[PDB]
């Protein structure tokens, strides 16, 4: 009853891992809960308020009682508990997030971060600032190499090395890089792995 709201919150955190697990991974997190954590923050503010109040009270009334210690001990733990929840949730949220910023940006010619992450505005803007700052953070890693990378792509090794891509209602032709593949619905291109990696992440290509 004392610290249990955090147990319920992480209990809810669990279900997003369930949605990232088997899964299938489309992202589409329901929302970031600002309300329930606001409840948590009001509860914890309550706590630390009574804490400094009693911290004033030992200075006068309690007179360093053996019992007093407990309040600064036990209730202190509660602060930690909320923290233990609040970060555990939060890191989970960054884990479901940064990976998404990894596997797709997105990808050639990134060329900008847009239309991605169906959560969009529904997810908190505090995370989105972190996010845009994070893909800005990875742009520098993109700028050190000189591989070339394409780090974002090709998690799965090339074979061999030409494939066949079957158009999937995409228009097209937007293939400007390397060559004008001239995208055309209902058209399969006997194209190497090179531009396939880049174009498959977008949603144009279908069968590898």
């Amino acid at each position: 009853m004392y610290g249990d709201l955090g147990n319920k919150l992480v209990l809810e955190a669990k279900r997003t891992k369930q949605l990232y697990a088997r899964s299938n991974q489309d992202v589409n997190l329901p929302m970031y809960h600002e309300d329930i954590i606001r409840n948590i923050l009001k509860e914890v503010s309550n706590l630390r308020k009574n804490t400094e109040y009693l911290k004033e009270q030992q200075q006068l009334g309690m007179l360093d009682d053996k019992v007093a210690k407990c309040q600064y001990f036990v209730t202190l733990l509660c602060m930690e508990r909320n923290k233990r929840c609040l970060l555990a949730y939060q890191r989970l949220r960054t884990d479901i997030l940064d990976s998404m910023a990894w596997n797709n940006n997105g990808l050639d010619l990134m060329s900008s971060i847009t239309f991605s992450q169906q959560d969009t505005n529904n997810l908190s803007h505090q995370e989105q600032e972190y996010l845009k700052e994070y893909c800005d953070l990875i742009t520098d890693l993109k700028s050190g190499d000189l591989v070339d990378i394409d780090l974002s792509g090709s998690l799965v090794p090339p074979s061999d090395v030409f494939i066949d891509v079957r158009v999937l209602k995409d228009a097209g032709e937007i293939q400007t890089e390397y060559g004008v593949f001239n995208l055309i619905k209902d058209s399969q291109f006997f194209v190497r792995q090179s531009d396939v990696e880049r174009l498959i992440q977008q949603g144009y290509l279908q069968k590898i």
């Binding site: 009853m1 209990l11 697990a21 233990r84 555990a88």
Partner: protein, 159 residues
């Protein structure tokens, strides 16, 4: 710690009675809590109250889950025993309580139970039925990981 299983593991209630009186009850209008009151506490706070004192603040009365009836029943047929009903956390939990109370006796017991489940879980690692329903959450997670390695290695086996 950050993983959800641990922070959820700390959420579980234990029957721990107070060694001492503590006015300023945070649970309601006592105001103090009379000595030797039996109050259920989650593990997170109760964990360091047994250490800090040279007499500790709490007795640590053994949880109903660890009742010697249970630790006996798990020595018969673990494979048919239902863990998911009792807690459901066991290994995530029991691992803490074995260190907290420093009990040697049951190590040899649970160290056995977990082999006996697993010699069964390499059996459902091959491609459920009812059984998948009675695993402990964390154990269950390992079942995902194994079943996925196998499934993926089979899907690689052909085309």
């Amino acid at each position: 710690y950050y993983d959800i299983d641990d922070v959820l593991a700390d959420g579980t209630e234990f029957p721990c009675k107070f060694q001492y009186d503590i006015p300023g009850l945070g649970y309601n209008p006592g105001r103090p809590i009379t000595k030797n009151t039996k109050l259920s506490l989650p593990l997170w706070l109760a964990r360091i109250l047994a250490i800090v004192g040279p007499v500790p603040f709490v007795e640590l009365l053994p949880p109903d889950m660890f009742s010697t009836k249970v630790m006996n029943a798990i020595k018969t047929d673990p494979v048919a025993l239902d863990l998911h009903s009792i807690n459901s956390h066991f290994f995530s939990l029991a691992i803490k309580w074995i260190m907290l109370f420093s009990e040697k006796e049951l190590a040899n017991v649970v160290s056995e139970l977990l082999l006996q489940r697993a010699q069964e879980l390499n059996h459902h690692a091959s491609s459920t039925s009812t059984f998948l329903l009675k695993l402990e959450e964390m154990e269950k997670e390992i079942y995902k990981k194994s079943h996925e390695s196998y499934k993926d290695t089979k899907r690689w086996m052909f085309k």
